[PDB]
């Protein structure tokens, strides 16, 4: 439930099944150092 | 364009988010069923006895 | 010609680092034998003196 | 012998990992691609002369 809780904090799960991703949570976390490395590239590119 | 494709990027870093959240809801899932299958075998050995 | 020189250098550098990594990679994976045959080694003696 | 001493040098700092060796790289192909790089040096050495 403490779960479910966290993942319908933010989107739902309907969404979550409709895009594929790691179960692996390293994985996860590495995708999302590169999103986090994809913003900072944008901000500082873009100004 | 870049700033349209990083926000595309950061709502699918909030879908990880969400996605690791999800596998951890389906993990615990996981671990209660199990827990379950012994709470069905220990009530079958007091059934035995 | 000095977009041209940066190309070069960034794409050797790359190279080599793309090269070097292995290194690690096979370290870690050193580590997931070494430890897994120190520890069950121990463990097959356990059974085997009991 | 030069990667041996890069990789004292990462592991010395943790740099020696996948995520750092691939962030370098993704850091110098963005550099590299965005920033498009004899006719420069010729044409140079006619203007020159």
């Given at each position: 439930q403490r779960q479910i809780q966290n993942a319908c904090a933010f989107c739902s799960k309907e969404r979550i099944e409709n895009v594929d991703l790691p179960d692996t949570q390293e994985e996860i976390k590495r995708e999302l150092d590169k999103v986090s490395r994809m913003i900072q590239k944008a901000e500082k590119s873009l100004g | 364009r870049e700033l349209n494709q990083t926000s595309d990027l950061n709502e699918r870093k909030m879908l990880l988010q969400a996605?690791?959240?999800?596998?951890?809801?389906?993990?615990?899932?996981?671990?209660?069923?199990?827990?379950?299958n012994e709470i069905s075998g220990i009530q079958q050995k007091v059934d035995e006895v | 010609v000095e977009s041209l020189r940066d190309f070069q250098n960034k794409k050797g550098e790359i190279e080599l680092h793309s090269q070097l990594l292995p290194y690690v990679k096979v370290k870690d994976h050193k580590e997931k034998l070494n430890i897994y045959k120190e520890e069950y080694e121990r463990a097959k003696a356990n059974l085997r003196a009991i | 012998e030069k990667l041996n001493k890069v990789a004292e040098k990462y592991e010395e700092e943790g740099n020696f990992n996948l995520s750092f060796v691939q962030d370098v790289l993704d850091k110098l192909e963005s550099e590299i691609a965005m920033v498009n790089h004899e006719s420069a040096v010729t044409i140079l050495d006619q203007v020159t002369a």
């Open positions: - | 996605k690791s959240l999800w596998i951890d809801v389906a993990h615990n899932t996981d671990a209660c069923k199990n827990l379950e | - | -």
